[PDB]
Amino acid sequence: QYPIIYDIRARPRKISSPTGSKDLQMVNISLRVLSRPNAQELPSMYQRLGLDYEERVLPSIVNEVLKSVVAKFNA
């Protein structure tokens, strides 16, 4: 049973995307997202998330999300 390292930590990831909205525009979408990993689920995260998963995976997620919100005309 070798130790697994996660550092299950809430980081304030400053995210910046120029995405306009439904229309085109230079909109500096600054989202400082304070976020953790799913400590309530299961150890397999180590294979996928491992360490420094915050800036690893979550800044891609936030880009998809801000598109589903901002790029749909919200801004």
């Binding site: 049973q1 070798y2 130790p3 697994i4 150890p43 180590y46 294979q47």
Partner: peptide
């Protein structure tokens, strides 16, 4: 020492696939 020379990288979540010097990548779950 032998913990990783004689024994594979058997640490939780890790895998160490057999590259056979004389046959190539032994595509085996090991």
């Amino acid at each position: 020492g032998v913990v990783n020379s004689a024994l594979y990288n058997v640490d939780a979540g890790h895998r160490a696939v057999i590259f056979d010097r004389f046959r190539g990548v032994q595509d085996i779950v090991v």
